[PDB]
């Protein structure tokens, strides 16, 4: 599953949905991580591929995995304003109050970025 996991990281990085599905069905390590500690779920959350995020969580991706800086995929999705991905990560057990290296939560990030739609979702969902 390790060679497949390396491929999975690059398919999630490029937003290759069909490729991620084939790789998961073949037993790829869902919690593999690249040169930055980003897991496939961090890479999927960054580009905004909601279907890849859902497939990775179905195959057991760690919703609270941290990259080299302590960022979870909730931090990743909130920084780039991917609301739908934020809602799915939360439904699948993401710690809404997880803090980054500056002590900031997904809510703090949304306020820092002026994303009122994101801030409101975080308030309503928790």
């Amino acid at each position: 599953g390790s060679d497949l996991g390396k491929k999975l990281l690059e398919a999630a990085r490029a937003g290759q949905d069909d490729e991620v599905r084939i790789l998961m069905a073949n037993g790829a390590d869902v919690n593999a991580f690249d040169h930055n500690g980003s897991t496939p779920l961090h890479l999927a959350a960054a580009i905004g591929h909601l279907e890849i995020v859902e497939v990775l969580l179905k195959y057991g991706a760690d919703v609270n995995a941290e990259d080299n800086w302590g960022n979870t995929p909730l931090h990743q999705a909130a920084w780039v304003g991917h609301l739908e991905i934020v809602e799915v990560l939360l439904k699948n057990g993401a710690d809404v109050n997880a803090q980054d290296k500056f002590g900031k939560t997904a809510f703090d990030i949304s306020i820092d970025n002026g994303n009122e739609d994101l801030a409101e979702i975080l308030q309503k969902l928790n």
């Binding site: 690059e10 990085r13 040169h35 800086w69 990743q76």
Partner: protein, 131 residues
């Protein structure tokens, strides 16, 4: 004993049942050689064991494809390069030390920085190249 076992003998008939190998092994199975110049996955060797090259290394003809396991040890990237690493795609807001990193690929498929004011992606280095 399979011809690929060392003089020490074997516990079974096949190449996966030697006490030790004559030279190379892949996953504990004795092989004639690693996939250095042909075959998939392309490989490098470390202490007579065969290990896979990173999938983003371009398979090379006649010469080695990598000298290590990382995407920073390829002879040539198959798609794009971000710093020392061969990648399928340039950063699309992936978090780094100071927040999301966005890059665009140049003519030579090298990932280059987006302007600091491109809150989303970019197709070039200028502020007018945002999105």
């Amino acid at each position: 004993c399979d011809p690929l076992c060392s003089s020490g003998g074997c516990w079974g008939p096949g190449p996966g049942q030697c006490l030790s190998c004559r030279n190379y092994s892949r996953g504990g199975v004795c092989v004639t050689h690693c996939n250095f110049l042909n075959g998939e996955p392309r490989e490098f060797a470390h202490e007579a064991e065969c290990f896979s090259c990173h999938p983003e290394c371009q398979p090379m003809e006649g010469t080695a494809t990598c000298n290590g396991s990382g995407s920073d040890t390829c002879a040539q990237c198959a798609h794009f390069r971000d710093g020392p690493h061969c990648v399928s795609s340039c950063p699309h807001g992936v978090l780094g030390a100071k927040g999301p990193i966005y890059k665009y690929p140049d003519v030579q498929n090298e990932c280059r920085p987006c302007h600091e004011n491109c809150t989303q992606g970019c197709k070039g280095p200028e502020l007018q190249d945002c999105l």
